[PDB]
From a paper:
The lasso peptide MS-271 is a ribosomally synthesized and post-translationally modified peptide (RiPP) consisting of 21 amino acids with D-tryptophan at the C-terminus, and is derived from the precursor peptide MslA. MslH, encoded in the MS-271 biosynthetic gene cluster (msl), catalyzes the epimerization at the Cα center of the MslA C-terminal Trp21, leading to epi-MslA. Herein, based on X-ray crystallographic studies in association with MslA core peptide analogues, we show that MslH is a metallo-dependent peptide epimerase with a calcineurin-like fold. The crystal structure analysis, followed by site-directed mutagenesis, docking simulation, and ICP-MS studies demonstrate that MslH employs acid/base chemistry to facilitate the reversible epimerization of the C-terminal Trp21 of MslA, by utilizing two pairs of His/Asp catalytic residues that are electrostatically tethered to a six-coordination motif with a Ca(II) ion via water molecules.
Each monomer is composed of a large domain with a grip-like subdomain (G-domain: Ala141-Pro234) and a cover-like subdomain (C-domain: Ser317-Trp363). As a result, α6’ from another monomer, together with the four antiparallel β-sheets on the G-domain and part of the C-domain of the monomer, forms a large cleft on the edge of the αββα architecture in the core structure. The crystal structure analysis of MslH revealed that the subdomains (C- and G-domains) were characteristically involved in interactions with other monomers to form dimers as well as the substrate-binding cleft on each dimer, and the dimers formed an octamer composed of eight monomers. In addition, an architecture that would construct a six-coordination motif, consisting of four amino acid residues Glu44, Asn87, His259, and His261 and two water molecules (w1 and w2), was detected around the C-terminal carboxyl group of MslA Phe20 in the MslH:MslAΔTrp21 crystal structure. This six-coordination motif is conserved in the MslH:apo and MslH:MslA Trp21G structures, although one of the oxygen atoms of the C-terminal carboxyl group of MslA Gly21 occupied the space used by the w1 water molecule in the MslH:MslA Trp21G structure, and is located at the entrance of the central ββ barrel behind the cleft. Thus, the MslH crystal structure suggested that MslH possesses a rearranged structural analogue of the Fe(II)-binding site in YmdB. These rearrangements were also conserved in the MslH:apo and MslH:MslA Trp21G structures.
Residue numbers in the entry:
A (entry chain A), B (entry chain A), C (entry chain A): 1 to 208, 211 to 439
């Protein structure tokens, strides 16, 4: 029997050194990560190779660029396989993502989710260890249009970028609501501005009894509703690569970045659940989600775990030394601002954004044990990111103390209850999933 | 008195050599262009410096990339000042636009509308001749988000790109229609998916009695309607650069690319009219529009001409040798396709798109005469692009014959009548604007 | 509680290897430096990246250029954060300072005080350690005009250089002395040579009842005097960066290079005292001065220490292997000179300059202990640089023996008495400041 352990974690938004402090609880986290066969995280920052140019990314909270020396903080902490597909990997454009891959390869760090072309971004990376091998696939459902990689044609090269999981939303409305929408379209003169497109394309492209108005899809249904669905091409392409990786490694882990919420902020979008189920149907041993910056529930599906969101494992956005002009413009200034003052005014001196809420400063590191591909243990290690501490101290991870760990483990159990997930709890505040195996 | 002549033209979508054929009407066009002090066109193609990667641009009709030798076709034909801000300048990304500027500078071709940063894209270019100087400013209202250039910050460099003229549209709806829109928002569960944004930002960002639903702005009014307005920052920045250029050149020409229609396809958007009036208020001597691929009206405002659209002066999209994989994917294929077959199937063997309509194959070259900044003549030269000819022959310009020129001059007069523009007509089918000077 | 130790030191003018000798007192110094969380020094030499060209710097004692391998001597000795703003950082011009930053970054050495532009030179550097973080800011009040860095404009790049603290001197003279100065100006014909400047600028620029003659500022006062004041822009910009750094690190240290004397050589200029007080008012935890090559007093201000001058920690000017032609020209030669003979004749075989005076060969290394930003200890370690030894042996640091340390500690106490500073003295000749905490 082959026995392999895998640590999982969420967003690694690292911008400073000294990631692991002298706190014994922080050193114990590093010992935990180093003790596993593979430790996975999501690199939610662009290590600067000097190459590239800042992109306009206000919806993502601004640019997230750091000195490349943060990569040594990541590996020294114990992380050894990096997922890179997310809404910040392209913060320095195509040249930036080329520089990131150069930096990662020169340091010997296995990574997936970005590439010089679409195939390269979709490929798994194979991390080989003496005890066995892990294949990591990384994709993101949250990114700016055009940032996805592209494969070459016979005449033109590809385009560097990220591995995409696109998705569409459809608004279910009643026939009465539907008629008003088409009435607004005609009476406002909006339909009159598509008159040329009717001659060009042959018919009004707004008639799909489906309907495209305002860039949104409307569908007549009995009761109002809201549905989301994966892009069939991305879903079937990513699923195909999972089947490929299953033949070439002991363990297949799919990492998926997704900000989009379900009916509630605690809930993943329905398309993300269909995606996660598809990955395990294709042979993946675990699905690790991230994006929201807080924890979501844990689902066991066909005896494999789905972590819909592990939050942040490092959170140092407000310590960024590199703020672009477009980010500075989101804040009205009388005189030029410095990065720290810009982030302090962006939040209203910490009264808004993520600072005042505890859910944004708790994290979780699951440690999974597999024996011949069968999950035999899933230990849960709550992580404290320092809620309420000064801005320069919070965001660095440590194993939470007993009292904080119990509160976090309670939250995870409550978030996981709709999936039927049960948890055993240890005296130290750690826990593990009840497995049907 | 200083006397200066300026030829204007629309989109130059050149992908092949032999731009000026041996046809005497084509050679006469080159003689006309060469005979002026300045000849302006809009470079609607990316000259390939080998650098860059194709971007996803399906809304613009695909990528538009050509051998850099087409630049010698452009200058040999008589064009001497290039506007470069449009929806295709970024078809090879930021590296492509850096390569384009390298190619243009190495050939000594003055250009505006793109730059290594936003200031560089906004700057006028000064074309100095023995008789005097012309300042060209170039901006585009049609481009993919993020393609605009960016200026540096203290910490981060800028971003190469185009000079933008952004604009917003607002839907005027009745209070009854407004209430249904907010009812759809709440009943579909759409408002429930913004619950986290209410805690983060402080309030529902959909409440501006203005309203943002579906990514569109809705405003309660007495009668349904549709309005557009320039981005105040772009308008005031571009206007500022026009005032700067007026102090440094005899003539200031503003070239603006705009696909967006008004109430009718023949009509420019209201924001474009406000922009054009603003440019002349600031000191511009002419405003030349392009984008739609057909002609629009001509307006005289404060004794200066506004050409809302001069159509295409060269139209060789279907002869492109460089089709990207994402463009190929817009066409369903059984076996791999070649560019010519791809463009033939993209249009349904020429039954759709621009091929079957005459308005897409007529053009116009105005020749303006200024004396000490006063417009003293505005001659109109209709151009034939070869409607109905084989795909490899159509798209090259020549002075239209008498019968075709008269039809085109009639169209221009009809399109210009709502502005009060009158035209004198010559025996050869050319004409000129009736000037109040 | 976070507990952090910081070693401070003065000018590091290192040009040779073997910085730490086999002497046990030298090895004990390295053990002391290595034992702290952060050890700061001022790099008073240009590590040669092969780039640059020697500048004319006779006022600073000539060029100070060394093999880049001296950087390994600096870090192996225990120094871990480098201040680089001083009157020698630009000895190889802008290319030299670019090469220095390349050399420092490739070796992983944190540094501040120089940059590719003014912002980069003003920024703090953040040194992160397991126990906490230190922010270092570095500026110089002594440099050749034009050597300060410059920030970019929209049209032009910045200029690499140093972080400046400019300052002006004003001569207070009586009205009788004032009238003679204006009489000399008119009667010598000096005022007649500004006749064109009166037409150009509008008025005589020598009339500010202030007065600018001979490039000096004169002001009428009741009694003759002499005052100095910081450049308000540099003071307010540096103060702003201190407030920024206070939000992002546990400790903020400001290092300021200043040759200028006060009323006495032992005294700092009044502008330097105002600067140091301003830094602590803004949140700095320590101010470390250097420049004079001898010790100055120590001030406690708002329970934070100000070391107006720690002298030299390494002094190997006369061992430089790289003497420029302009430096050689300061010495009259019959035949070409070698560096050692040039430095021996520059001093008159050691009868002039710094060789014969003991104050130039004593140094001091304070070791500060902070607990949550509160200074809880400030130990003083006298350093011996080998006064009276051969030129090739003197300049390397070691902990002074008991007798020499007591003499140095006495000097420091006497220099610090005007500030109210008291010292406790240990049996070994070390000491510490009496803290009001
Ligand atoms: Ca994210
Ligand atoms: Ca276009
Ligand atoms: Ca000095």
């Amino acid at each position: 029997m082959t026995r392999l352990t895998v640590a999982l974690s969420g967003d690694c938004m690292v911008t400073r050194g000294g990631l692991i402090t002298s706190d014994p609880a922080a050193e114990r986290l590093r010992d935990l990560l180093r003790g596993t066969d593979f430790a996975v995280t999501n690199l939610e920052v662009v290590p600067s190779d000097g190459r590239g140019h800042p992109v306009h990314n206000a919806v993502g909270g601004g640019c997230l660029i750091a000195d490349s020396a943060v990569l040594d903080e990541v590996t020294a902490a114990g992380f050894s396989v990096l997922g890179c597909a997310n809404n910040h990997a392209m913060d320095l454009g195509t040249e930036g993502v080329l520089g990131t891959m150069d930096l990662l390869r020169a340091r010997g760090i296995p990574y997936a989710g970005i590439g010089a072309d679409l195939t390269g971004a979709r490929r798994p990376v194979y991390a080989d260890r003496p005890g066995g091998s892990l294949a990591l696939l990384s994709c993101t459902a949250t990114f700016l249009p055009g940032q996805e990689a592209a494969d070459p044609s016979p005449e033109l090269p590809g385009r560097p970028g990220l591995n995409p999981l696109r998705h569409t939303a459809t608004m279910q409305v009643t026939a009465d609501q539907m008629d008003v929408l088409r009435t607004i379209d005609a009476e406002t003169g909006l339909r009159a501005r598509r008159a040329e497109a009717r001659a060009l394309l042959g018919v009004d492209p707004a008639l799909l009894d489906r309907l495209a108005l305002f860039g949104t899809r409307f569908r007549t249904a009995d009761a109002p509703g809201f549905t989301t669905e994966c892009d069939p091409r991305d879903l079937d392409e990513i699923a195909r690569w999972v089947g490929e990786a299953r033949l070439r490694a002991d363990l297949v882990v799919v990492s998926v970045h997704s900000h989009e919420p379900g009916p509630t902020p605690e809930t993943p979008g329905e398309f993300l659940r269909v995606f996660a189920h598809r990955m395990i149907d294709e042979g993946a041993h675990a699905v690790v989600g991230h994006g929201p910056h807080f924890l979501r529930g844990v689902e066991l599906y066909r005896n494999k775990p789905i972590f819909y969101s592990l939050g942040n494992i490092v959170s140092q956005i407000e310590l960024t030394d590199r703020v672009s002009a477009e980010d500075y413009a989101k804040v009205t200034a009388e005189r030029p601002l410095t990065p720290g003052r810009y982030y302090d005014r962006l939040s209203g001196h910490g009264t808004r954004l993520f600072a005042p809420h505890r859910r944004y400063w708790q994290s979780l590191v699951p440690v999974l044990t597999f024996e011949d591909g069968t999950l035999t243990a899933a230990r849960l290690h709550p992580v404290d990111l320092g809620f309420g501490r000064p801005v320069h101290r919070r965001g660095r991870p440590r194993l939470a103390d007993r009292a904080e760990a119990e509160k976090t483990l309670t939250d995870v159990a409550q978030l996981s209850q709709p999936y039927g997930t049960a948890i055993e709890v240890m005296d130290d505040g750690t826990g593990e999933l009840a497995l049907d195996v």
